[PDB]
Design a binder for this molecule. Structure first.
Ligand SMILES: [Zn+2]
Ligand SMILES: [Zn+2]
Ligand SMILES: [Zn+2]
Ligand SMILES: [Zn+2]
Ligand SMILES: [Zn+2]
Ligand SMILES: [Zn+2]
Lengths: 29, 29, 29
């Protein structure tokens, strides 16, 4: 259960980064 | 403590989804 | 281990709110 949560947090961190970069693109057109 | 962590992760996953949906609407809509 | 995971979640929450505000900015021009 704990390790599963950690893997989910890892996934979210990646999505985290993905959205940050996309918003940076959209900000600039 | 465990519950609090799980619920925070679940809330983040939902926010994950809501924000991506809004980004898509802004980009394409 | 636990303490590190809680720090990571708090960092994600903060990024959560930052990107939500950024998206709101973009929606309004
Ligand atoms: Zn559970
Ligand atoms: Zn671990
Ligand atoms: Zn292990
Ligand atoms: Zn920037
Ligand atoms: Zn710029
Ligand atoms: Zn705690």
């Amino acid at each position: 259960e704990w390790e599963a949560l950690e893997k989910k947090l890892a996934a979210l961190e990646s999505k985290x980064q993905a959205l940050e970069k996309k918003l940076e693109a959209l900000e600039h057109g």
